[PDB]
Design a protein around this ligand. Structure first.
Ligand SMILES: *[C@@H]1O[C@H](CO)[C@@H](O)[C@H](O)[C@H]1NC(C)=O
Ligand SMILES: *[C@@H]1O[C@H](CO)[C@@H](O)[C@H](O)[C@H]1NC(C)=O
Ligand SMILES: *[C@@H]1O[C@H](CO)[C@@H](O)[C@H](O)[C@H]1NC(C)=O
Ligand SMILES: *[C@@H]1O[C@H](CO)[C@@H](O)[C@H](O)[C@H]1NC(C)=O
Ligand SMILES: *[C@@H]1O[C@H](CO)[C@@H](O)[C@H](O)[C@H]1NC(C)=O
Ligand SMILES: *[C@@H]1O[C@H](CO)[C@@H](O)[C@H](O)[C@H]1NC(C)=O
Ligand SMILES: *[C@@H]1O[C@H](CO)[C@@H](O)[C@H](O)[C@H]1NC(C)=O
Ligand SMILES: *[C@@H]1O[C@H](CO)[C@@H](O)[C@H](O)[C@H]1NC(C)=O
Ligand SMILES: *[C@@H]1O[C@H](CO)[C@@H](O)[C@H](O)[C@H]1NC(C)=O
Ligand SMILES: *[C@@H]1O[C@H](CO)[C@@H](O)[C@H](O)[C@H]1NC(C)=O
Ligand SMILES: *[C@@H]1O[C@H](CO)[C@@H](O)[C@H](O)[C@H]1NC(C)=O
Ligand SMILES: *[C@@H]1O[C@H](CO)[C@@H](O)[C@H](O)[C@H]1NC(C)=O
Lengths: 49, 50, 371, 460, 50
């Protein structure tokens, strides 16, 4: 969906450095201050909150 | 030199599965090839911070 | 004022029938002063001196149409190819009558070939009509012969484009092997029972033996093949109650030759009413120039419309194959081929004969073993 | 080994330079008995062709056969394919109609050609379209066969691309057209590039139609395959001056170097198979006195020389009867009405001397048109963002637009290259909206000397 | 009004240069001003164009 975005190609070419396999990897990475933002569906992160 | 599918969709196209029961993201690209039922969950996108 | 017509043919009786149909060609055309010379050439053990004798004799005869009428070919690959190759060197239409290989279907390979028999893709269209009759939508495709199987699969997809259905399983592999039995057991694991097969006689016999050792012809199973799978040891290994096809006036020769000569003669008398009519040169002794109205006379063969003949309305498609032929639907009633259907150009007409199935009842099997 | 090279031609190449093409060549002889027979031929009739075949195969069992042709007759290669199915001898088609692409080779044959397939040529033509960002196109296909695989290959190529092609649906033909319903499909075409698939005899009527339809305009592009554009001599007057064609007839490679490379491939496969099994050359005696099922070979070079390396050239073959790295030639029709060669083909990429695409705006002589504009700008950060091209696609992202910049090396030299780059920004969006509304074409590039402008003694 | 440029004929048409003006038409609604015997040729040509 971000690849179809013609003006957000910077995000598509930047997230390839930080693409993660599972969401628990992303939770542990943002928990250990390795991440600073994470685009994701809402209710999953609400339950994780 | 071909774009092909992987994951649950790639194993469903190979016939290794019968019905994806999962939080499956609905979009244009998947609907071109497989079929969707009526959705159970409705949500958008958000940013996780600390 | 002369027209030459060539033919590669063995028996003297069918050569006399050919000359008799040549004599009957100018029977209804009034007092038109055209001449008609016939040419009939016989067999050789190989196909090299066949090509040599045919090419120099039909150049020295300067023929217009070349007839291919050989069922009893000892070479089981069924290759009358070099005659069509030589006449495609000068873009001269060869009318075949017997073989149904899909190598002649591509007009890039055989530039100037037509034939009065359709390929087995039309039998796949008949099988689609059988799906229309029995309300079936899920098939299992099994293909051994890859020379025709890709074109048969393409025509099958052309059939499935309108219904927007898809085949449940497709298989194309190397002929000559014997274990496809693991793939046969994988096809057992599927839901539908409709099985579609296209092979030679020996491969059909091998897969019938594999289906009988795994009793794959039992209750609820559907089996439906053509003419190249119901003869020889495949017929010996065939399950009782299997459904096959048969060509009306396909194996018959003489009336088919008469219909062919009538088609050719009416096409020539249609073509003679136009301007810039050319002749075949002496291509053997130093004439490499192609015949000028090659594509023009090929379009005349494309535009050939008829309403008379022994078989009836003979007509040719975009590929130059027989439109709207007469088919028979045969049933193997206890090792006896019993005709249980006829088929005209678009409609399946079952007769009063009963369809005994290889499983249980004589009623139609709703073979959708849903998961 | 025992190889007979015969050339049926009218372009007079004599026989003694063929003896000079074998004598000092192959100084490292790995087969013990290498013997060639060079023969010439004036006519192309199949009687004399099979006569030479039966004279050479009975000529002490020659195991190699190389043939080239002058004219455009592809049925000669079909006769050679039948002879290869009969004689089980590796046969090579060099030039003319002897190496023109037929539809489907047989697994029961040992025949090969030296050329590029229609799928490889379609790949090169779509690479041409991708390098110029001419993504808005159409597809005109007639009923000449080989079209179904052509359309399917186009669909599989577009659908497996990072481009996002503006692919109009396939415009097809039915017969020798009535020009009643096919023109209705031609009026669906509001695009620029028109992809044509037909034959040479059809193309005269097609281009006379499109000239009468006015579809030969200044923005209307036309890219055609190799079979429709024949030899360099026969050029009808109905061709648009600016027509793009692709064929593998490289003018930097004559027939002699090509048959030298073919003999190198033959000797390389023979020497590589000679170490596995010893008694490799096994032919048939003659054409006459034959029975059913002759002595068929078991170790054949047809399924052996899939890969080959000859003097650095990667002339390796395919499993269908084609090459892996052919030599594609991309020509345009100049104002001199001659086939002007522009694009040579590398191992993988397209080299373009005139990569900056010029107008040739007089495609027909009666075309008064003024819709191209030479537009220059200066790089500033909030308005003119200029970036490198994406190496993953070799294509600018389609919100941006192409540009070129004259880049030198140092002050020692003065000659530089016009490197193509991408442009987005505020005024770029202004220019795109003007090109949408006013509906013109433009020529975007960058300034060379420096900043905006200042007059120093009447020099801006 | 989104009116395109006005199609002008010359004579009894050659269907070569008038056909360029006829193929300028990419709109739906067409207004024709001519005489009765001309309109048969015009609409027969327009049927031949589609
Ligand atoms: C057809 O013409 C050829 C020309 O040589 C002649 O030999 C032949 O007698 C004629 N027809 C036949 C087969 O009798
Ligand atoms: C395969 O064929 C062999 C005989 O060639 C036979 O022994 C075996 O049972 C078959 N089944 C398998 C393993 O596919
Ligand atoms: C034959 O069919 C019976 C009943 O369905 C089954 O028990 C048996 O396993 C089958 N035999 C084979 C080898 O498929
Ligand atoms: C072939 O058809 C003709 C005409 O009906 C007939 O005379 C002939 O007996 C048939 N051949 C067979 C079936 O023996
Ligand atoms: C047919 O013959 C006449 C000779 O002038 C002429 O109409 C034409 O050139 C010929 N056919 C074509 C279309 O070449
Ligand atoms: C065979 O098909 C033809 C098609 O015209 C038809 O006329 C004829 O009646 C058919 N044969 C039968 C059903 O006897
Ligand atoms: C047999 O052909 C005729 C031709 O009109 C037509 O009735 C139909 O296509 C076929 N049979 C029936 C009765 O459906
Ligand atoms: C072609 O023609 C000439 C003259 O007929 C003859 O010498 C020979 O067959 C050919 N040319 C060659 C190879 O000398
Ligand atoms: C080249 O050919 C050999 C033949 O045995 C094959 O095994 C190998 O994969 C190929 N190697 C190269 C150089 O790609
Ligand atoms: C083209 O690239 C291939 C590897 O992709 C390389 O082996 C070859 O050397 C290059 N070109 C040639 C033919 O030198
Ligand atoms: C040429 O210019 C480049 C970029 O300024 C610089 O890196 C390079 O050293 C120069 N070359 C010389 C030394 O002439
Ligand atoms: C080349 O020389 C000119 C004049 O001395 C100087 O202004 C310029 O900076 C030099 N080129 C570069 C970009 O180094």
């Amino acid at each position: 969906y971000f690849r179809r975005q013609v003006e957000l190609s910077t995000m598509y070419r930047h997230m390839e450095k930080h693409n993660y396999e599972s969401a628990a990897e992303a939770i542990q990475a943002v928990r250990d201050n390795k991440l600073h933002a994470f685009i994701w569906d809402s209710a999953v992160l609400e339950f994780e909150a | 030199n071909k774009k092909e599918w992987n994951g649950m969709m790639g194993e469903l196209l190979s016939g290794q599965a019968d019905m994806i029961v999962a939080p499956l993201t609905i979009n244009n690209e998947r609907a071109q090839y497989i079929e969707f039922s009526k959705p159970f969950k409705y949500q958008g996108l958000t940013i996780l911070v600390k | 004022k002369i027209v030459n017509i060539g033919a590669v043919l063995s028996t003297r009786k069918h050569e006399q029938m050919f000359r008799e149909a040549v004599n009957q060609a100018n029977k209804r055309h009034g007092s038109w002063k055209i001449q008609l010379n016939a040419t009939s050439v016989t067999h050789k053990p190989n196909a090299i001196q066949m090509a040599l004798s045919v090419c120099e004799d039909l150049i020295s005869s300067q023929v217009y149409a070349i007839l291919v009428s050989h069922p009893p070919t000892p070479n089981d690959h069924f290759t009358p190819t070099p005659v069509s190759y030589t006449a495609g060197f000068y873009r001269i239409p060869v009318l075949g009558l017997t073989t149904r290989m899909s190598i002649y279907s591509d007009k890039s390979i055989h530039l100037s070939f037509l034939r009065t028999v359709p390929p087995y893709s039309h039998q796949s269209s008949v099988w689609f009509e059988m799906m229309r009759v029995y309300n079936w939508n899920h098939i299992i495709l099994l293909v051994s012969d890859d020379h025709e199987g890709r074109a048969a699969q393409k025509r099958l997809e052309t059939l499935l484009e309108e219904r927007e259905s898809k085949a449940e399983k497709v298989l194309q592999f190397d002929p000559g092997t014997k274990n496809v039995t693991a793939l046969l057991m994988e096809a057992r694991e599927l839901e539908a029972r409709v099985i579609i097969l296209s092979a030679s006689e020996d491969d059909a016999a091998t897969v019938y033996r594999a289906a009988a050792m795994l009793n794959m012809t039992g209750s609820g199973y559907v089996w439906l093949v053509g003419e190249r799978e119901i003869s020889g040891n495949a017929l010996r290994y065939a399950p009782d109650g299997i459904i096959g096809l048969q060509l009306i006036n396909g194996k018959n020769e003489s009336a088919h030759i008469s219909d062919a000569v009538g088609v050719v003669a009416q096409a020539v008398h249609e073509l003679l009413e136009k301007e810039n009519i050319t002749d075949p040169p002496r291509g053997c002794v130093g004439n490499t120039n192609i015949w000028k109205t090659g594509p023009l006379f090929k379009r005349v063969l494309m535009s050939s419309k008829y309403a008379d003949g022994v078989t009836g309305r003979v007509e040719f498609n975009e590929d130059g194959d027989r439109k709207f032929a007469n088919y028979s639907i045969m049933n193997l009633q206890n090792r006896k081929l019993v005709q249980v259907g006829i088929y005209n150009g678009t409609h399946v007409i079952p007769n009063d004969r009963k369809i005994i199935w290889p499983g249980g009842e004589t009623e139609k099997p709703r073979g959708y073993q849903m998961s | 080994l025992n190889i007979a090279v015969l050339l049926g031609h009218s372009h007079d190449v004599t026989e003694r330079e063929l003896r000079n093409l074998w004598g000092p060549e192959q100084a490292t002889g790995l087969p013990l008995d290498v013997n060639v027979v060079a023969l010439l031929m004036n006519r192309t009739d199949p009687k004399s062709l099979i006569t030479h075949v039966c004279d050479l195969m009975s000529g002490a069992r020659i195991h190699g056969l190389v043939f080239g042709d002058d004219t455009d007759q592809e049925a000669v290669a079909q006769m050679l394919d039948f002879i290869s199915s009969q004689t089980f001898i590796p046969i090579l088609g060099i030039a003319g109609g002897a190496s023109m692409i037929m539809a489907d080779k047989d697994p029961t044959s040992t025949f090969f050609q030296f050329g590029a397939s229609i799928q490889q040529q379609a790949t090169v033509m779509l690479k041409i379209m991708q390098d110029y960002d001419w993504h808005v196109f159409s597809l005109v296909t007639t009923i000449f066969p080989g079209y179904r695989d052509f359309i399917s290959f186009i669909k599989t190529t577009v659908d497996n691309s990072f481009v996002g092609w503006d692919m109009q649906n396939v415009i097809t033909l039915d017969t020798s057209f009535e020009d009643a319903k096919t023109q209705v499909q031609l009026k669906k075409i509001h695009s620029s590039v028109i992809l044509l698939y037909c034959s040479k005899d059809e193309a005269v009527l097609i281009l006379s139609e499109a000239r009468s339809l006015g579809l030969t305009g200044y923005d209307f592009f036309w890219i055609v395959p190799s079979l429709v554009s024949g030899n360099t001599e026969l050029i009808p007057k109905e061709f648009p001056s600016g027509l793009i064609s692709v064929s593998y007839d490289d003018w930097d490679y004559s027939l002699e170097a090509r048959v030298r490379d073919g003999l190198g491939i033959l000797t390389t496969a023979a020497s590589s198979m000679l170490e596995k099994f010893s008694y490799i050359p096994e032919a048939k005696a003659s054409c006459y006195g034959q029975a059913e099922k002759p002595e068929t070979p078991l170790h054949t070079l047809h399924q052996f020389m899939v890969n080959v390396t000859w003097d650095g050239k990667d002339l390796s073959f395919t499993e269908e009867g084609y090459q892996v790295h052919p030599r594609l030639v991309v020509i345009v029709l100049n104002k001199d009405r001659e086939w002007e060669k522009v694009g040579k083909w590398e191992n993988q990429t397209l080299s373009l001397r005139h990569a900056v695409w010029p107008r040739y705006k007089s495609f027909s002589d009666c075309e008064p048109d003024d819709n191209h504009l030479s537009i220059v700008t200066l790089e500033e950060a909030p308005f003119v963002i200029v970036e490198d091209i994406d190496p993953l696609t070799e294509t600018c992202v389609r919100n941006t637009v192409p540009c070129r910049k004259f880049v030198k090396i140092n002050n020692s030299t003065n000659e530089g290259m016009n490197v193509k780059k991408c442009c987005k920004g505020f005024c770029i969006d202004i220019l795109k909206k003007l090109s949408r509304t006013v509906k013109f074409t433009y020529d975007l590039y960058l300034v060379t000397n420096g900043k905006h402008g200042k007059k120093v003694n009447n020099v801006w």
